[PDB]
Protein backbone atom coordinates (compact mmCIF):
# COMPACT_ATOMS: atom_id res chain seq x y z
CA UNK A 1 0.00 0.00 0.00
CA UNK A 2 1.04 3.68 -0.34
CA UNK A 3 2.34 5.31 2.86
CA UNK A 4 2.51 9.08 3.37
CA UNK A 5 5.87 10.77 2.87
CA UNK A 6 7.58 13.07 5.41
CA UNK A 7 8.22 15.50 2.49
CA UNK A 8 4.45 16.16 2.29
CA UNK A 9 4.45 17.84 5.69
CA UNK A 10 5.11 21.54 6.40
CA UNK A 11 7.90 22.43 8.83
CA UNK A 12 5.25 23.37 11.35
CA UNK A 13 3.31 20.05 11.12
CA UNK A 14 6.60 18.29 11.65
CA UNK A 15 7.73 20.38 14.66
CA UNK A 16 4.23 19.98 16.04
CA UNK A 17 4.40 16.18 15.70
CA UNK A 18 7.82 16.22 17.38
CA UNK A 19 6.40 18.35 20.20
CA UNK A 20 3.28 16.19 20.67
CA UNK A 21 5.06 12.83 20.91
CA UNK A 22 7.86 14.14 23.17
CA UNK A 23 5.79 15.98 25.80
CA UNK A 24 2.64 14.02 26.66
CA UNK A 25 0.48 14.83 29.71
CA UNK A 26 0.72 11.97 32.23
CA UNK A 27 -1.20 11.95 35.56
CA UNK A 28 -2.83 9.32 37.79
CA UNK A 29 -5.81 9.44 40.20
CA UNK A 30 -7.80 12.58 39.32
CA UNK A 31 -11.55 13.26 38.99
CA UNK A 32 -13.92 15.60 37.14
CA UNK A 33 -17.53 16.34 38.03
CA UNK A 34 -17.85 18.99 35.31
CA UNK A 35 -18.87 18.59 31.65
CA UNK A 36 -18.24 21.30 29.11
CA UNK A 37 -20.22 21.31 25.86
CA UNK A 38 -21.51 17.74 26.15
CA UNK A 39 -18.19 16.10 25.11
CA UNK A 40 -15.46 17.49 27.38
CA UNK A 41 -14.37 16.82 30.96
CA UNK A 42 -12.78 19.74 32.89
CA UNK A 43 -10.09 19.20 35.56
CA UNK A 44 -9.42 22.64 37.08
CA UNK A 45 -5.80 23.42 37.98
CA UNK A 46 -4.82 19.79 37.27
CA UNK A 47 -2.84 20.45 34.06
CA UNK A 48 0.89 21.26 33.74
CA UNK A 49 1.94 24.21 35.96
CA UNK A 50 -1.57 24.32 37.48
CA UNK A 51 -3.27 25.04 34.15
CA UNK A 52 -6.89 23.99 33.61
CA UNK A 53 -7.08 20.64 31.77
CA UNK A 54 -9.80 20.04 29.17
CA UNK A 55 -10.17 16.38 28.07
CA UNK A 56 -12.10 16.12 24.81
CA UNK A 57 -14.10 13.02 23.75
CA UNK A 58 -15.85 12.02 20.50
CA UNK A 59 -19.25 11.68 22.21
CA UNK A 60 -21.46 12.58 25.16
CA UNK A 61 -21.40 8.89 26.18
CA UNK A 62 -17.65 8.92 26.73
CA UNK A 63 -17.70 12.16 28.71
CA UNK A 64 -20.56 10.76 30.83
CA UNK A 65 -18.81 7.39 31.32
CA UNK A 66 -15.82 9.01 33.06
CA UNK A 67 -17.67 11.84 34.87
CA UNK A 68 -17.10 11.44 38.62
CA UNK A 69 -14.56 8.62 38.44
CA UNK A 70 -10.97 8.30 39.66
CA UNK A 71 -9.23 8.35 36.22
CA UNK A 72 -5.66 8.08 34.88
CA UNK A 73 -4.58 10.29 31.97
CA UNK A 74 -1.99 9.66 29.26
CA UNK A 75 -2.41 11.84 26.21
CA UNK A 76 -0.94 14.33 23.79
CA UNK A 77 -1.43 17.84 25.26
CA UNK A 78 -1.62 21.12 23.30
CA UNK A 79 -2.31 24.85 23.75
CA UNK A 80 -3.29 26.57 20.50
CA UNK A 81 -7.11 26.52 20.00
CA UNK A 82 -7.67 25.08 23.47
CA UNK A 83 -10.94 26.77 24.49
CA UNK A 84 -10.67 28.37 27.96
CA UNK A 85 -13.04 27.47 30.76
CA UNK A 86 -12.06 30.13 33.35
CA UNK A 87 -9.50 32.99 33.20
CA UNK A 88 -6.64 30.56 33.87
CA UNK A 89 -4.62 29.15 30.93
CA UNK A 90 -6.27 26.06 29.40
CA UNK A 91 -4.50 22.86 28.32
CA UNK A 92 -6.13 20.23 26.11
CA UNK A 93 -5.92 16.58 25.06
CA UNK A 94 -8.22 14.08 23.38
CA UNK A 95 -9.11 10.74 25.01
CA UNK A 96 -6.21 9.27 26.99
CA UNK A 97 -8.53 8.30 29.85
CA UNK A 98 -8.71 5.05 31.88
CA UNK A 99 -10.01 3.96 35.33
CA UNK A 100 -7.46 4.35 38.12
CA UNK A 101 -8.43 1.12 39.97
CA UNK A 102 -7.76 -1.27 37.05
CA UNK A 103 -4.05 -2.03 37.69
CA UNK A 104 -1.51 -4.87 37.47
CA UNK A 105 1.12 -5.64 40.15
CA UNK A 106 4.03 -5.58 37.69
CA UNK A 107 4.28 -3.80 34.33
CA UNK A 108 3.20 -5.77 31.28
CA UNK A 109 6.04 -5.77 28.72
CA UNK A 110 5.15 -5.43 25.00
CA UNK A 111 7.77 -6.09 22.34
CA UNK A 112 8.08 -3.86 19.29
CA UNK A 113 9.99 -5.39 16.39
CA UNK A 114 11.69 -2.74 14.22
CA UNK A 115 12.81 -2.83 10.61
CA UNK A 116 14.52 -0.01 8.66
CA UNK A 117 14.45 -0.43 4.86
CA UNK A 118 13.48 -4.08 5.41
CA UNK A 119 16.50 -4.81 7.64
CA UNK A 120 15.61 -6.04 11.16
CA UNK A 121 17.01 -3.81 13.91
CA UNK A 122 16.92 -4.11 17.72
CA UNK A 123 13.58 -5.07 19.29
CA UNK A 124 12.22 -2.25 21.47
CA UNK A 125 10.06 -2.63 24.60
CA UNK A 126 7.15 -0.66 25.92
CA UNK A 127 5.58 -1.13 29.40
CA UNK A 128 2.30 -0.55 31.18
CA UNK A 129 0.73 -1.49 34.50
CA UNK A 130 -2.78 -0.75 33.27
CA UNK A 131 -5.12 -3.76 32.72
CA UNK A 132 -6.89 -1.57 30.16
CA UNK A 133 -4.70 0.93 28.22
CA UNK A 134 -5.48 3.54 25.60
CA UNK A 135 -4.13 2.98 22.10
CA UNK A 136 -2.95 6.60 22.33
CA UNK A 137 -0.67 5.83 25.30
CA UNK A 138 1.00 2.93 23.53
CA UNK A 139 1.32 4.93 20.28
CA UNK A 140 3.02 7.86 22.10
CA UNK A 141 5.38 5.44 23.84
CA UNK A 142 6.38 3.85 20.50
CA UNK A 143 6.77 7.18 18.70
CA UNK A 144 8.87 8.55 21.59
CA UNK A 145 11.30 5.65 21.09
CA UNK A 146 11.35 6.21 17.31
CA UNK A 147 11.86 9.96 17.77
CA UNK A 148 14.80 9.39 20.17
CA UNK A 149 16.51 6.67 18.19
CA UNK A 150 15.56 7.21 14.52
CA UNK A 151 14.66 10.92 14.47
CA UNK A 152 11.36 10.42 12.66
CA UNK A 153 10.17 13.96 13.29
CA UNK A 154 13.41 15.74 12.35
CA UNK A 155 13.16 17.33 8.87
CA UNK A 156 16.65 16.42 7.79
CA UNK A 157 16.83 12.84 9.12
CA UNK A 158 16.93 10.07 6.51
CA UNK A 159 13.55 8.52 7.59
CA UNK A 160 10.81 9.37 5.06
CA UNK A 161 8.11 6.76 5.62
CA UNK A 162 6.93 4.70 8.63
CA UNK A 163 4.12 2.38 9.73
CA UNK A 164 3.37 1.21 13.28
CA UNK A 165 1.21 -1.93 13.42
CA UNK A 166 -0.40 -3.42 16.54
CA UNK A 167 -0.59 -7.20 15.93
CA UNK A 168 -3.57 -8.06 18.13
CA UNK A 169 -4.59 -11.45 19.54
CA UNK A 170 -8.14 -10.27 18.95
CA UNK A 171 -9.35 -10.14 15.34
CA UNK A 172 -9.16 -6.35 14.71
CA UNK A 173 -5.60 -4.99 14.36
CA UNK A 174 -4.54 -1.32 14.51
CA UNK A 175 -1.96 0.77 12.69
CA UNK A 176 -0.57 4.29 12.37
CA UNK A 177 1.12 5.92 9.40
CA UNK A 178 3.53 8.29 11.25
CA UNK A 179 3.52 10.90 8.44
CA UNK A 180 -0.25 10.84 7.89
CA UNK A 181 -0.94 13.84 10.14
CA UNK A 182 -4.54 15.01 9.89
CA UNK A 183 -3.48 18.69 9.80
CA UNK A 184 -0.53 20.87 10.69
CA UNK A 185 -1.65 22.08 14.16
CA UNK A 186 -1.82 20.05 17.40
CA UNK A 187 -5.63 20.18 17.70
CA UNK A 188 -5.84 18.50 14.26
CA UNK A 189 -2.98 16.01 14.78
CA UNK A 190 -4.21 14.75 18.15
CA UNK A 191 -7.89 14.47 17.17
CA UNK A 192 -7.34 10.87 15.95
CA UNK A 193 -7.43 9.92 19.63
CA UNK A 194 -10.86 11.37 20.48
CA UNK A 195 -12.60 7.96 20.37
CA UNK A 196 -10.65 7.03 23.56
CA UNK A 197 -9.89 3.59 22.00
CA UNK A 198 -8.87 1.30 24.84
CA UNK A 199 -7.30 -2.18 24.70
CA UNK A 200 -6.89 -4.99 27.21
CA UNK A 201 -3.18 -4.83 27.65
CA UNK A 202 -2.77 -8.62 27.44
CA UNK A 203 -4.65 -8.72 24.08
CA UNK A 204 -1.64 -7.32 22.20
CA UNK A 205 0.68 -9.92 20.68
CA UNK A 206 3.47 -7.46 19.67
CA UNK A 207 4.10 -4.24 17.72
CA UNK A 208 5.72 -4.15 14.27
CA UNK A 209 7.46 -0.96 13.17
CA UNK A 210 8.58 -0.48 9.58
CA UNK A 211 10.55 2.64 8.70
CA UNK A 212 12.00 3.57 5.33
CA UNK A 213 14.63 6.05 4.15
CA UNK A 214 14.36 8.26 1.12
CA UNK A 215 16.79 7.10 0.39
Amino acid at each position, epitope marked *: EDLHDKSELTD*LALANAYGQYNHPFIKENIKSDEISGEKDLIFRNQGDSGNDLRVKFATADLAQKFKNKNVDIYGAS*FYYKCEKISENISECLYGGTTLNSEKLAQERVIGANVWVDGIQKETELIRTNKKNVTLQELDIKIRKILSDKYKIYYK*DSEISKGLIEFDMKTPRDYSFDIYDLKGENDYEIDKIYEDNKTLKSDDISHIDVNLYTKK
Partner: T-cell receptor, first 113, second 109 residues
Framework: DGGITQSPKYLFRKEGQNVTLSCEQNLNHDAMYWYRQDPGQGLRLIYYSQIVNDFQKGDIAEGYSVSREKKESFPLTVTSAQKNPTAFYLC???????????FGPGTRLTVTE | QLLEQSPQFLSIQEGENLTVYCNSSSVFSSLQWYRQEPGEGPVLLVTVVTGGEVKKLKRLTFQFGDARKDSSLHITAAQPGDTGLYLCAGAGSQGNLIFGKGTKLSVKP
Protein backbone atom coordinates in the same frame (compact mmCIF):
# COMPACT_ATOMS: atom_id res chain seq x y z
CA ASP B 1 22.88 16.86 41.52
CA GLY B 2 25.83 18.25 39.48
CA GLY B 3 27.16 21.02 37.20
CA ILE B 4 29.51 22.28 34.47
CA THR B 5 32.75 24.19 35.16
CA GLN B 6 35.59 25.97 33.34
CA SER B 7 39.09 26.93 34.40
CA PRO B 8 40.77 29.21 34.88
CA LYS B 9 38.80 32.46 35.07
CA TYR B 10 41.55 34.50 33.36
CA LEU B 11 44.28 33.56 30.86
CA PHE B 12 47.08 35.70 29.48
CA ARG B 13 49.37 34.71 26.59
CA LYS B 14 51.96 36.21 24.27
CA GLU B 15 50.89 36.21 20.63
CA GLY B 16 51.79 32.90 18.99
CA GLN B 17 51.58 30.68 22.05
CA ASN B 18 48.96 27.89 21.87
CA VAL B 19 46.71 27.48 24.90
CA THR B 20 44.03 24.95 25.85
CA LEU B 21 40.83 25.75 27.78
CA SER B 22 39.21 23.19 30.03
CA CYS B 23 35.49 22.43 30.30
CA GLU B 24 34.23 19.63 32.53
CA GLN B 25 30.69 18.41 33.14
CA ASN B 26 29.15 15.72 35.40
CA LEU B 27 25.56 16.39 34.31
CA ASN B 28 25.55 13.14 32.25
CA HIS B 29 25.15 15.19 29.05
CA ASP B 30 26.11 13.87 25.61
CA ALA B 31 26.53 17.18 23.80
CA MET B 32 29.07 19.91 24.53
CA TYR B 33 29.68 23.29 22.89
CA TRP B 34 32.30 26.06 22.69
CA TYR B 35 31.35 29.71 22.04
CA ARG B 36 33.15 33.02 21.98
CA GLN B 37 31.39 36.27 22.87
CA ASP B 38 32.53 39.57 21.38
CA PRO B 39 30.72 42.87 22.10
CA GLY B 40 29.44 43.45 18.54
CA GLN B 41 28.37 39.89 17.79
CA GLY B 42 27.07 38.11 20.91
CA LEU B 43 27.60 34.32 21.09
CA ARG B 44 29.34 32.67 18.17
CA LEU B 45 29.74 28.90 18.02
CA ILE B 46 33.33 27.67 17.62
CA TYR B 47 33.13 23.85 17.83
CA TYR B 48 30.65 21.31 19.19
CA SER B 49 30.32 17.62 19.99
CA GLN B 50 27.01 15.77 19.89
CA ILE B 51 28.44 12.67 21.55
CA VAL B 52 31.71 11.13 22.91
CA ASN B 53 34.52 10.94 20.27
CA ASP B 54 32.50 12.97 17.73
CA PHE B 55 32.94 16.70 17.06
CA GLN B 56 32.34 19.14 14.19
CA LYS B 57 33.05 22.72 13.16
CA GLY B 58 30.96 25.65 14.34
CA ASP B 59 30.63 28.91 12.40
CA ILE B 60 34.06 30.26 13.44
CA ALA B 61 36.31 27.18 13.69
CA GLU B 62 39.44 28.66 12.03
CA GLY B 63 42.47 28.50 14.34
CA TYR B 64 40.74 26.35 16.93
CA SER B 65 40.82 22.61 17.54
CA VAL B 66 39.10 20.28 19.98
CA SER B 67 38.92 16.64 21.05
CA ARG B 68 36.29 14.48 22.78
CA GLU B 69 37.84 11.37 24.36
CA LYS B 70 35.53 11.46 27.34
CA LYS B 71 31.86 12.16 27.93
CA GLU B 72 32.58 14.59 30.74
CA SER B 73 35.06 17.00 29.09
CA PHE B 74 35.62 19.02 25.92
CA PRO B 75 38.97 20.92 25.80
CA LEU B 76 39.35 23.85 23.45
CA THR B 77 42.76 24.65 22.05
CA VAL B 78 43.45 28.10 20.66
CA THR B 79 46.27 28.01 18.11
CA SER B 80 48.65 30.68 16.76
CA ALA B 81 46.65 30.55 13.52
CA GLN B 82 43.59 32.18 15.14
CA LYS B 83 44.38 35.94 14.70
CA ASN B 84 41.88 37.54 17.13
CA PRO B 85 42.15 35.09 20.05
CA THR B 86 41.22 37.75 22.67
CA ALA B 87 37.66 36.98 23.83
CA PHE B 88 35.35 35.61 26.54
CA TYR B 89 35.07 31.84 26.13
CA LEU B 90 31.96 29.92 27.11
CA CYS B 91 31.37 26.20 27.11
CA UNK B 92 27.98 24.58 27.47
CA UNK B 93 26.44 21.13 27.52
CA UNK B 94 23.04 19.62 26.81
CA UNK B 95 21.39 16.28 27.48
CA UNK B 96 21.28 15.67 23.74
CA UNK B 97 22.30 17.88 20.81
CA UNK B 98 19.89 20.85 20.21
CA UNK B 99 18.27 20.55 23.67
CA UNK B 100 18.44 23.35 26.31
CA UNK B 101 22.08 24.24 27.15
CA UNK B 102 23.68 24.79 30.56
CA PHE B 103 26.70 27.07 30.57
CA GLY B 104 29.93 27.09 32.47
CA PRO B 105 31.20 30.31 34.14
CA GLY B 106 33.42 31.28 31.17
CA THR B 107 37.11 32.15 30.68
CA ARG B 108 38.66 35.46 29.68
CA LEU B 109 41.56 35.11 27.27
CA THR B 110 43.71 38.10 26.41
CA VAL B 111 46.53 37.81 23.90
CA THR B 112 48.98 40.58 23.05
CA GLU B 113 51.72 40.98 20.42
CA GLN C 1 18.77 30.28 10.36
CA LEU C 2 18.15 33.50 12.25
CA LEU C 3 16.70 34.70 15.54
CA GLU C 4 15.91 38.42 15.94
CA GLN C 5 15.41 40.10 19.35
CA SER C 6 13.82 43.44 20.14
CA PRO C 7 14.33 45.88 21.73
CA GLN C 8 18.11 45.54 21.60
CA PHE C 9 18.57 47.88 24.55
CA LEU C 10 15.98 48.80 27.12
CA SER C 11 16.29 51.19 30.03
CA ILE C 12 13.32 51.45 32.35
CA GLN C 13 12.31 52.57 35.82
CA GLU C 14 11.82 50.21 38.74
CA GLY C 15 8.16 49.20 38.92
CA GLU C 16 7.36 49.34 35.24
CA ASN C 17 6.36 46.43 33.03
CA LEU C 18 8.22 45.50 29.89
CA THR C 19 8.07 42.96 27.06
CA VAL C 20 10.96 41.60 25.09
CA TYR C 21 10.39 39.74 21.84
CA CYS C 22 12.20 37.07 19.87
CA ASN C 23 11.19 36.14 16.28
CA SER C 24 12.18 34.09 13.24
CA SER C 25 10.93 32.94 9.86
CA SER C 26 12.02 29.46 11.00
CA VAL C 27 9.97 26.97 13.05
CA PHE C 28 11.38 25.79 16.41
CA SER C 29 10.63 22.63 18.38
CA SER C 30 11.81 24.46 21.51
CA LEU C 31 12.89 27.92 22.65
CA GLN C 32 15.05 28.87 25.67
CA TRP C 33 15.56 32.20 27.49
CA TYR C 34 18.68 33.04 29.46
CA ARG C 35 19.83 35.93 31.67
CA GLN C 36 23.55 36.79 31.60
CA GLU C 37 25.60 39.11 33.86
CA PRO C 38 28.76 40.65 32.29
CA GLY C 39 31.74 38.23 32.44
CA GLU C 40 29.57 35.37 33.71
CA GLY C 41 27.78 32.31 32.32
CA PRO C 42 24.26 32.80 30.89
CA VAL C 43 21.66 31.38 33.34
CA LEU C 44 18.79 29.30 31.95
CA LEU C 45 15.43 30.88 32.80
CA VAL C 46 12.92 28.67 30.89
CA THR C 47 12.35 26.26 27.98
CA VAL C 48 9.08 26.41 26.11
CA VAL C 49 8.29 23.35 23.92
CA THR C 50 4.68 23.64 22.69
CA GLY C 51 3.22 26.22 20.30
CA GLY C 52 1.03 28.60 22.32
CA GLU C 53 2.63 27.54 25.64
CA VAL C 54 2.57 30.17 28.45
CA LYS C 55 4.78 29.68 31.46
CA LYS C 56 4.87 31.92 34.54
CA LEU C 57 7.82 31.99 36.90
CA LYS C 58 7.18 34.70 39.53
CA ARG C 59 7.35 38.16 37.83
CA LEU C 60 8.43 36.60 34.47
CA THR C 61 5.89 35.36 31.91
CA PHE C 62 7.12 33.48 28.82
CA GLN C 63 5.04 32.72 25.73
CA PHE C 64 5.74 30.50 22.71
CA GLY C 65 3.99 31.67 19.53
CA ASP C 66 1.13 29.59 18.14
CA ALA C 67 3.13 28.94 14.95
CA ARG C 68 6.37 28.16 16.80
CA LYS C 69 8.08 31.13 15.09
CA ASP C 70 8.40 33.54 18.02
CA SER C 71 8.36 33.97 21.79
CA SER C 72 8.08 36.74 24.30
CA LEU C 73 9.28 37.41 27.81
CA HIS C 74 7.20 39.78 29.89
CA ILE C 75 8.47 41.20 33.13
CA THR C 76 6.07 42.79 35.56
CA ALA C 77 7.08 45.18 38.37
CA ALA C 78 10.70 45.46 37.11
CA GLN C 79 13.42 45.37 39.81
CA PRO C 80 17.05 46.64 39.64
CA GLY C 81 18.22 43.01 40.01
CA ASP C 82 16.53 42.22 36.66
CA THR C 83 19.29 44.20 34.96
CA GLY C 84 21.22 41.99 32.50
CA LEU C 85 21.45 40.54 28.99
CA TYR C 86 18.36 38.52 28.05
CA LEU C 87 19.12 35.98 25.31
CA CYS C 88 16.61 33.80 23.47
CA ALA C 89 17.77 30.59 21.80
CA GLY C 90 16.06 28.11 19.54
CA ALA C 91 16.57 24.44 18.80
CA GLY C 92 18.64 24.39 15.56
CA SER C 93 18.62 21.80 12.73
CA GLN C 94 22.20 20.52 13.05
CA GLY C 95 22.43 19.46 16.72
CA ASN C 96 22.88 23.15 17.79
CA LEU C 97 21.16 26.21 19.34
CA ILE C 98 20.48 29.40 17.34
CA PHE C 99 20.97 32.48 19.56
CA GLY C 100 19.42 35.96 19.36
CA LYS C 101 21.71 38.95 19.96
CA GLY C 102 19.90 39.76 23.21
CA THR C 103 17.94 42.53 24.87
CA LYS C 104 20.25 44.45 27.20
CA LEU C 105 18.01 45.47 30.08
CA SER C 106 18.86 48.21 32.66
CA VAL C 107 16.36 48.75 35.44
CA LYS C 108 16.92 52.04 37.30
CA PRO C 109 16.31 52.17 41.07
Amino acid sequence: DGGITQSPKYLFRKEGQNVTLSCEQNLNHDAMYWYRQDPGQGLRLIYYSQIVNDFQKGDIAEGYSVSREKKESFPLTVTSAQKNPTAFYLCASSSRSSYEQYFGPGTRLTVTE
Amino acid sequence: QLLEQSPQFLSIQEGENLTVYCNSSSVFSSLQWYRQEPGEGPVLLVTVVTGGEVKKLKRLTFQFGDARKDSSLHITAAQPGDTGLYLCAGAGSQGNLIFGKGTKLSVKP
